[PDB]
mmCIF file of N, CA and C in Angstrom:
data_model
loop_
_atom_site.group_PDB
_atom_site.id
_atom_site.type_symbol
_atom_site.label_atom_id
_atom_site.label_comp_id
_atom_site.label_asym_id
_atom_site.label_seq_id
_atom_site.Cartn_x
_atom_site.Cartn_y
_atom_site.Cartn_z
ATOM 1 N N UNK X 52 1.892 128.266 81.161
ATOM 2 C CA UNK X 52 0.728 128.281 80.294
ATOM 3 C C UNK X 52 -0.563 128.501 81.058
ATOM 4 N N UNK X 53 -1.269 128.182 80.297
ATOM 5 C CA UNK X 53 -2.977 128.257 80.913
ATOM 6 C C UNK X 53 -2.868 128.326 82.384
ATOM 7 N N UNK X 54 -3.691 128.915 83.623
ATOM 8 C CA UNK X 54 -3.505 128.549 85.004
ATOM 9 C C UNK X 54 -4.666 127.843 85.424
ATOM 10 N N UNK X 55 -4.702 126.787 84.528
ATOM 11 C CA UNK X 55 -5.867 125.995 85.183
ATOM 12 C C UNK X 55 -7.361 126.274 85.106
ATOM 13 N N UNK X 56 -8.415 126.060 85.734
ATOM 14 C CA UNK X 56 -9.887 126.046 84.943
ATOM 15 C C UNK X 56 -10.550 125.871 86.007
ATOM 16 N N UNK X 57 -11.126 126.874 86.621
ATOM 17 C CA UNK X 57 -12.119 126.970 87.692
ATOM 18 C C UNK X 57 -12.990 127.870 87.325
ATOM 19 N N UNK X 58 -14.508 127.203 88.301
ATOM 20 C CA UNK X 58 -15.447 127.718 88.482
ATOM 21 C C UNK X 58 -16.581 127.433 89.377
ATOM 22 N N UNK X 59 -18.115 127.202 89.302
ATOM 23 C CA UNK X 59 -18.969 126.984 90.653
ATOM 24 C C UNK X 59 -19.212 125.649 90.563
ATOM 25 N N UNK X 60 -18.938 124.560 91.066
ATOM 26 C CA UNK X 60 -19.612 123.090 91.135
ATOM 27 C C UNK X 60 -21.047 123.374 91.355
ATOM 28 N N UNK X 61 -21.528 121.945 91.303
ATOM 29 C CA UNK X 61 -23.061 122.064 90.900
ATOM 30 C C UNK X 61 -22.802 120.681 90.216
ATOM 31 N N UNK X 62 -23.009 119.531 90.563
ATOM 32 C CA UNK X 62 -23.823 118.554 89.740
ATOM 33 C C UNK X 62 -25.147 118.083 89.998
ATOM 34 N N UNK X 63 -26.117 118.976 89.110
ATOM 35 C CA UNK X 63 -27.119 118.679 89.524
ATOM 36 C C UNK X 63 -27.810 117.195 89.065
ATOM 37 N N UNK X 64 -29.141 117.300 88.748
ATOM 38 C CA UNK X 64 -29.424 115.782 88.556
ATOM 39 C C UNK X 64 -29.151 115.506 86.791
ATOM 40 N N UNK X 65 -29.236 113.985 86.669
ATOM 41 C CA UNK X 65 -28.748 113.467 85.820
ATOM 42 C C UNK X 65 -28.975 111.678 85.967
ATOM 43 N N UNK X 66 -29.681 111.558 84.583
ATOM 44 C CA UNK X 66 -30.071 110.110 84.759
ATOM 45 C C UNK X 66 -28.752 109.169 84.275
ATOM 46 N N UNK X 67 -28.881 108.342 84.934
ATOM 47 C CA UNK X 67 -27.889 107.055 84.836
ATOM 48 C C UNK X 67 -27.985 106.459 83.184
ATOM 49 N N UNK X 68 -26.477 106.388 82.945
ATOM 50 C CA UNK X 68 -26.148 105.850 81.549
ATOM 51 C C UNK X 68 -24.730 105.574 81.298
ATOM 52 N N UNK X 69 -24.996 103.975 80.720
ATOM 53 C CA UNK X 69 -23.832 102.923 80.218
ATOM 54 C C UNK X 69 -22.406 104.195 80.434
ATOM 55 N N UNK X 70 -22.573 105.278 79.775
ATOM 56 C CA UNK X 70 -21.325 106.307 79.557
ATOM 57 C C UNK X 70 -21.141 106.949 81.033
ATOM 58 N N UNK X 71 -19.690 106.876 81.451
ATOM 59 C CA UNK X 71 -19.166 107.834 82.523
ATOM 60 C C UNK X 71 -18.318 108.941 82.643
ATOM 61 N N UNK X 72 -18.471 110.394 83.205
ATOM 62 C CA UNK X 72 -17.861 111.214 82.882
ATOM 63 C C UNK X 72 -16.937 111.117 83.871
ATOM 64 N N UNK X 73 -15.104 110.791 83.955
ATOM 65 C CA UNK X 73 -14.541 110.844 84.559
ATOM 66 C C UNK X 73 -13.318 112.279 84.382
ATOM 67 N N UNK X 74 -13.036 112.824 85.534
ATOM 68 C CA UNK X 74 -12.226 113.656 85.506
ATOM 69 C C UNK X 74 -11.467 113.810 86.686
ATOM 70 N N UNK X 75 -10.749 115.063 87.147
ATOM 71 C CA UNK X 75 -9.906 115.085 87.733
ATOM 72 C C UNK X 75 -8.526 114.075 87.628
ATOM 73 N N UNK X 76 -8.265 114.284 86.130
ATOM 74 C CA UNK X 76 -6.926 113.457 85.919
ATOM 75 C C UNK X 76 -5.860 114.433 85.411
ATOM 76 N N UNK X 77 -4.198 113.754 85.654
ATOM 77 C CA UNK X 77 -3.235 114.691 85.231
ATOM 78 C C UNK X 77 -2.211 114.252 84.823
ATOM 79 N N UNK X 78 -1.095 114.952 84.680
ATOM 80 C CA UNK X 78 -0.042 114.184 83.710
ATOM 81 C C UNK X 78 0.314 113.176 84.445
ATOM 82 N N UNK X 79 -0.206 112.793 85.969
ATOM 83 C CA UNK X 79 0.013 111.635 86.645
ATOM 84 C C UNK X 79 -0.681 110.560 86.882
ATOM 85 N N UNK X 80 -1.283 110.212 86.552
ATOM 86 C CA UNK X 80 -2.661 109.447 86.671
ATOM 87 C C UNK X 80 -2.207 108.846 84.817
ATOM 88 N N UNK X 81 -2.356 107.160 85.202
ATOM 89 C CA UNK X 81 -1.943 106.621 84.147
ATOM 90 C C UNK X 81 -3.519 105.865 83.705
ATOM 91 N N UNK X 82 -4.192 106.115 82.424
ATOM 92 C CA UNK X 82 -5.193 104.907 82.044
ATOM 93 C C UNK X 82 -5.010 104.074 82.627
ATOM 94 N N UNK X 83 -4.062 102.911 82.285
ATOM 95 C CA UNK X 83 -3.980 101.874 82.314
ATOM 96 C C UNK X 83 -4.153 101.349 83.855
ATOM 97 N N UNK X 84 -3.881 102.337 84.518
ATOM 98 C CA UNK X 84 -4.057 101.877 86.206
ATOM 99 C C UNK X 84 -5.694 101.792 86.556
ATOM 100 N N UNK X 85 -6.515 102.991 85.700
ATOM 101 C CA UNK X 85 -7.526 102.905 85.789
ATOM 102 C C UNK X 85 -8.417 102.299 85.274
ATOM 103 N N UNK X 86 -8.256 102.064 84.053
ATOM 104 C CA UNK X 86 -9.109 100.556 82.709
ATOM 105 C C UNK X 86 -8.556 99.361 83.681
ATOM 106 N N UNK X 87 -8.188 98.862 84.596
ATOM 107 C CA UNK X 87 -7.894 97.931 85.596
ATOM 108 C C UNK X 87 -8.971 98.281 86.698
ATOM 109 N N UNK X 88 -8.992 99.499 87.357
ATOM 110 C CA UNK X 88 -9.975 99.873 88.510
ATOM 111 C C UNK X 88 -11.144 99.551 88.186
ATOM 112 N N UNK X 89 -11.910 100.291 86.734
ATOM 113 C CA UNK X 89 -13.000 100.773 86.382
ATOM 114 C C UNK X 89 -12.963 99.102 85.951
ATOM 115 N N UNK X 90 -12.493 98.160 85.136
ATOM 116 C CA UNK X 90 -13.027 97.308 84.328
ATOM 117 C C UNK X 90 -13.394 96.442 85.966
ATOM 118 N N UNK X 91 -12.493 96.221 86.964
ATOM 119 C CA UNK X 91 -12.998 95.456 88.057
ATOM 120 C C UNK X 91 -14.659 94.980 88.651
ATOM 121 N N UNK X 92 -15.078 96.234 87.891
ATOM 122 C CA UNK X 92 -16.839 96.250 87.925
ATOM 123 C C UNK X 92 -17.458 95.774 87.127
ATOM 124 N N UNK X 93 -17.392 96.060 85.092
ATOM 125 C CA UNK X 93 -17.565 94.845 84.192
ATOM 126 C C UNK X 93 -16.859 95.252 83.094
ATOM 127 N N UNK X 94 -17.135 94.337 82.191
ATOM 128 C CA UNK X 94 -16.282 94.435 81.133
ATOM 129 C C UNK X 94 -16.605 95.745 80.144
ATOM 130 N N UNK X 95 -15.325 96.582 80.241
ATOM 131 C CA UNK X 95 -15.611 97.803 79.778
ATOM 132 C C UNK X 95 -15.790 98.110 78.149
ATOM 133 N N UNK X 96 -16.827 98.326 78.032
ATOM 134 C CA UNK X 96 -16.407 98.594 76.522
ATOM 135 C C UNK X 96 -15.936 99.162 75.570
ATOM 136 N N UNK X 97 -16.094 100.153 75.924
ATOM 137 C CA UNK X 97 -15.197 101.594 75.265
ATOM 138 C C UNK X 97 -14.258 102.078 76.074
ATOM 139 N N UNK X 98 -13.481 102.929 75.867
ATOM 140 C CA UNK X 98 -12.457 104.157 76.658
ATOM 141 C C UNK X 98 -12.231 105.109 75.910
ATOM 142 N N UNK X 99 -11.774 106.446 76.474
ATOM 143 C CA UNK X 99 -11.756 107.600 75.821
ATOM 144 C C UNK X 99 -10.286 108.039 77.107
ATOM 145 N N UNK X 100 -9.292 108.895 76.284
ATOM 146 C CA UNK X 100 -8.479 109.316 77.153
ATOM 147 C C UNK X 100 -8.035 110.677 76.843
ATOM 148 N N UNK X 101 -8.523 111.946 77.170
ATOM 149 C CA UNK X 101 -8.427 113.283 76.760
ATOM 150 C C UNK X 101 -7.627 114.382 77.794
ATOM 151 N N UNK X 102 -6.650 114.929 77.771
ATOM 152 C CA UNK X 102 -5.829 115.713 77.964
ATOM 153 C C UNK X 102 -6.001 117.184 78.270
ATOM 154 N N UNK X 103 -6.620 117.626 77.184
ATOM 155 C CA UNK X 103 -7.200 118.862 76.975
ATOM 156 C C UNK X 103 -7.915 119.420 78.729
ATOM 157 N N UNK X 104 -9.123 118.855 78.172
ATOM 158 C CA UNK X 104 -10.199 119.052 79.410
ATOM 159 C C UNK X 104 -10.117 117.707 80.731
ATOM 160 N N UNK X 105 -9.270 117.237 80.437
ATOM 161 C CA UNK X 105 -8.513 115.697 81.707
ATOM 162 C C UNK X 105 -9.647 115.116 81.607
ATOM 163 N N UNK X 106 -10.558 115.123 80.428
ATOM 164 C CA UNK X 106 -12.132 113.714 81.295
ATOM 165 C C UNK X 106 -11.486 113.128 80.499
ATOM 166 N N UNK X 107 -11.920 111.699 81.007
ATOM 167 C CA UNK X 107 -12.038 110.550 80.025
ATOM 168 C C UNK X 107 -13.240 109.618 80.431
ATOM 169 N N UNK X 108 -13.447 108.843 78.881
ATOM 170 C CA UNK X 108 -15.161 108.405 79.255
ATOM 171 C C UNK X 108 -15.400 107.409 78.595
ATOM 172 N N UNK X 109 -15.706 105.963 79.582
ATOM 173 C CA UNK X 109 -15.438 104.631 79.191
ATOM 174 C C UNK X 109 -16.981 104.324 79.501
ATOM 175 N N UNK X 110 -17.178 103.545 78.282
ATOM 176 C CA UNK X 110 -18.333 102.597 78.290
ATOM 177 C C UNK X 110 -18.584 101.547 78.490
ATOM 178 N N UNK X 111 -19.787 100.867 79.023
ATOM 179 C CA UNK X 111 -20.005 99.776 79.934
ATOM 180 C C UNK X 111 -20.729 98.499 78.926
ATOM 181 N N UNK X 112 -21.131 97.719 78.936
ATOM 182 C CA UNK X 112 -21.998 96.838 77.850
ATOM 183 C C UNK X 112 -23.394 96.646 78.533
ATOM 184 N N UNK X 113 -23.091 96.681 79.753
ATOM 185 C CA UNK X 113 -24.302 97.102 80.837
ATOM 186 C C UNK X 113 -24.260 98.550 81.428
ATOM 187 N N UNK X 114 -25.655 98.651 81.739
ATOM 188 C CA UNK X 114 -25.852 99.787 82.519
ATOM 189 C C UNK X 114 -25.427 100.012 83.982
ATOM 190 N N UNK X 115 -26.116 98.602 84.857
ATOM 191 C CA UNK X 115 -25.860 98.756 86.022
ATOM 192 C C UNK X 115 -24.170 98.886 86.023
ATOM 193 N N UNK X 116 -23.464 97.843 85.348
ATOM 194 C CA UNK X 116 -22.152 97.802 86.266
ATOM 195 C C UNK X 116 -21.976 99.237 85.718
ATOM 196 N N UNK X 117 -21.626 100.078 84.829
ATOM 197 C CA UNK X 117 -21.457 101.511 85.087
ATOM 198 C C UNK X 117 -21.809 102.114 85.750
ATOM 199 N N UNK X 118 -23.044 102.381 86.761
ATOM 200 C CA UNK X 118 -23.667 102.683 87.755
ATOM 201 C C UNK X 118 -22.669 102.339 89.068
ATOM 202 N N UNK X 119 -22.734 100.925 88.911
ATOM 203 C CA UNK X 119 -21.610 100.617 90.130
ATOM 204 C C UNK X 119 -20.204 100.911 90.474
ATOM 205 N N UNK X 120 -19.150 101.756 89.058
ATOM 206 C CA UNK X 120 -18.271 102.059 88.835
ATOM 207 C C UNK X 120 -18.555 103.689 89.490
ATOM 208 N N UNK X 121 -19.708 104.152 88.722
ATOM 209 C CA UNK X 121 -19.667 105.655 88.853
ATOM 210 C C UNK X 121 -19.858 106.108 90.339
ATOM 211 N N UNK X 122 -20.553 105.361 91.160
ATOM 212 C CA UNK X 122 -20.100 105.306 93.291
ATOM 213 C C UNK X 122 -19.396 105.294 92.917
ATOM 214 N N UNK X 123 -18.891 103.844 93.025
ATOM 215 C CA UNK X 123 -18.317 103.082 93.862
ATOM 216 C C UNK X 123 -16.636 104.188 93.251
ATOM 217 N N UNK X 124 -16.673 104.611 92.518
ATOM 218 C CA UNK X 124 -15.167 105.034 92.186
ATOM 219 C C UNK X 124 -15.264 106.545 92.693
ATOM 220 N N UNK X 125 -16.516 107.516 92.670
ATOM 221 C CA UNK X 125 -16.770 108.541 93.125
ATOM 222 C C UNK X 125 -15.943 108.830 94.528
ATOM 223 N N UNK X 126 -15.178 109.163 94.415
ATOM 224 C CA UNK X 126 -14.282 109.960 95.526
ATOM 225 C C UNK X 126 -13.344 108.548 95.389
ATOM 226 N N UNK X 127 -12.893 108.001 94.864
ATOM 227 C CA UNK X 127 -11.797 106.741 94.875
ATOM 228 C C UNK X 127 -10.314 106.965 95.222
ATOM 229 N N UNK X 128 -9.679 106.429 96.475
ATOM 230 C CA UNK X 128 -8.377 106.711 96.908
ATOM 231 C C UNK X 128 -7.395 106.527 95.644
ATOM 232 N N UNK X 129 -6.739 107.888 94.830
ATOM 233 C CA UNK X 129 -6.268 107.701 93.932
ATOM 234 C C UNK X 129 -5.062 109.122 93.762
ATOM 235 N N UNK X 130 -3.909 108.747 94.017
ATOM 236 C CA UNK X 130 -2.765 109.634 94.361
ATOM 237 C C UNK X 130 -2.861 109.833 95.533
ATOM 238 N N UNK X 131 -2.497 111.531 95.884
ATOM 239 C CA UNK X 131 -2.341 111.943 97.001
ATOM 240 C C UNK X 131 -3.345 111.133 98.101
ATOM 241 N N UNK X 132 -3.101 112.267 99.322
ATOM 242 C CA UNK X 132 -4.086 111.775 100.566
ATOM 243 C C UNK X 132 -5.246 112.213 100.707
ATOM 244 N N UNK X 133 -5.136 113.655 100.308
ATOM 245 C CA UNK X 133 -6.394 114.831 99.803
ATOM 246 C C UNK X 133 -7.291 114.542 98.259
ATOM 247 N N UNK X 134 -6.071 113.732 97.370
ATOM 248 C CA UNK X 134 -6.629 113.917 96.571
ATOM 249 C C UNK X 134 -7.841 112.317 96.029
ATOM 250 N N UNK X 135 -8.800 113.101 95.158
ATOM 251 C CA UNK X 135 -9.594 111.667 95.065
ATOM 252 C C UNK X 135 -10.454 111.818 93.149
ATOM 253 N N UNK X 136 -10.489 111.049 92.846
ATOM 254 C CA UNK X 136 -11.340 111.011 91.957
ATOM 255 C C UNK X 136 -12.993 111.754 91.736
ATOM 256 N N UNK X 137 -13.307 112.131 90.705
ATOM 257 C CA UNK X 137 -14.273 112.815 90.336
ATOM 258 C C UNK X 137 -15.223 112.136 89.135
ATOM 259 N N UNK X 138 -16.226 111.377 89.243
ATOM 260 C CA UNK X 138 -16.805 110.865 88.054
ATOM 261 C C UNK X 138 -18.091 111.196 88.418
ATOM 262 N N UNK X 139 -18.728 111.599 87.452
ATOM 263 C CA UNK X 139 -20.366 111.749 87.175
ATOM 264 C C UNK X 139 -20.973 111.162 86.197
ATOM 265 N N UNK X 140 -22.659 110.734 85.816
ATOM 266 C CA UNK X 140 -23.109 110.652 84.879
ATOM 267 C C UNK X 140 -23.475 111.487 83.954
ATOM 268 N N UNK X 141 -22.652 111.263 82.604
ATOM 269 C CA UNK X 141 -22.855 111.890 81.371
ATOM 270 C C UNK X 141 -24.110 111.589 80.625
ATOM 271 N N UNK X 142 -25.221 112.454 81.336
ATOM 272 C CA UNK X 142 -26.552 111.842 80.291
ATOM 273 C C UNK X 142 -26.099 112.459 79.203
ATOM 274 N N UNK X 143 -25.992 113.499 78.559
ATOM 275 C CA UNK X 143 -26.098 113.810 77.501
ATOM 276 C C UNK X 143 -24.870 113.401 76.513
ATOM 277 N N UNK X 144 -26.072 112.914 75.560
ATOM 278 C CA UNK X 144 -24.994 111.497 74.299
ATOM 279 C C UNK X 144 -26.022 110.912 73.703
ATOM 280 N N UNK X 145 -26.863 111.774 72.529
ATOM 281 C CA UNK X 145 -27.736 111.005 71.824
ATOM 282 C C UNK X 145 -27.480 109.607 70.910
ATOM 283 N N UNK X 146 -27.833 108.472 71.055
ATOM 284 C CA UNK X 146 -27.669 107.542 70.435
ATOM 285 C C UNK X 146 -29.132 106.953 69.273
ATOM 286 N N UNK X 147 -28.822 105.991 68.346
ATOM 287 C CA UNK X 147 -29.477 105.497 67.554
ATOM 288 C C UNK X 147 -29.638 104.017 67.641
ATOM 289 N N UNK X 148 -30.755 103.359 67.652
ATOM 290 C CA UNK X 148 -30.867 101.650 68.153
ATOM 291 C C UNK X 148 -32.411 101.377 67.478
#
């Protein structure tokens, strides 16, 4: 099927928010190993687990500890030896309050 989905990296800037864009996941990489990693920082509030495009995108009840997830997990020893995790901040996500 499909051969996969490339193109130019570039994360440019982007302000910090409760929501995290995580990716680089595959039919191996289980949630549940990770709603354990990610919650280790605070209590998570949301999760999202998508296939399609491999992000998934869990929400925080705080800001900072999402902040501290989105390092601190940024390049995170996860499978292979080469291989590592990919999370950025998802500013864009209009909300109502």
């Amino acid at each position: 099927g499909s051969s996969g989905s490339s193109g130019k990296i570039g994360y440019g800037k982007a302000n910090p928010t409760t929501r995290l864009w995580v990716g680089g996941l595959g039919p191996n990489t289980s949630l549940a190993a990770l709603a354990r990693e990610f919650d280790r920082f605070g209590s998570i509030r949301t999760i999202d687990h998508v296939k399609g495009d491999s992000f998934a995108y869990i929400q925080y009840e705080s800001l900072d500890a999402a902040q501290a997830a989105c390092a601190k997990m940024r390049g995170f020893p996860l499978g292979g030896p080469d291989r590592r995790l990919r999370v950025d901040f998802a500013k864009s996500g209009p909300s109502s309050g």
